[PDB]
Structure formats: structure tokens, C-alpha cells
Chains A and B, each alone.
With several copies, the nearest count.
Chain A
Amino acid sequence: FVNQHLCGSHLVEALYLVCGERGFFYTPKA
């Protein structure tokens, strides 16, 4: 699921699954 183009909710969803209890930051402007 990670080794593809991931945009929008798809990207957010991959971050959620990979990062787990760490959580993550989603900075699309940065």
C-alpha cells in the first residue's frame, strides 16, 4: 500500500497505518 502514488485521503490513510500510536503530521503546504 505504501509504494504507490498516494494523494489526499489515501495519503492520510497510509500515514495513519504506518505511524500507528506515534501519529503523524500531514503538511501538504510544507
Chain B
Amino acid sequence: GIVEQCCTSVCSLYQLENYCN
């Protein structure tokens, strides 16, 4: 999930926007 993708690894805008409503 977000932690694995953005905290444990380097985040991206593409991925961040998958969590916007």
C-alpha cells in the first residue's frame, strides 16, 4: 500500500494521486 510505495520506497505523483478522492 501507500507506505510500501511512498515511505519505504520513493513516492511518485502518479501513485500519490491514486489516493485522492
Contact = CB atoms under 8 A, between A and B. Distances in A.
Interface size class of A (residues with CB under 8 A): 20 to 34
B9 to A, nearest CB: 7
Given A4-B11, A6-B11, A28 B2 contact: yes
Q: Which of A2, A3, A8, A29 has the most CB of B within 10 A?
A: A2
Interface in A1-22: 2-8, 11, 14-15, 18-19, 22
Interface residues of B, number: 16
Interface of B: 1-3, 6-13, 16-17, 19-21
Given A15-B16, A28-B3, A30-B2, 5 more contacts: A2-B11, A7-B6, A11-B11, A19-B21, A27-B21
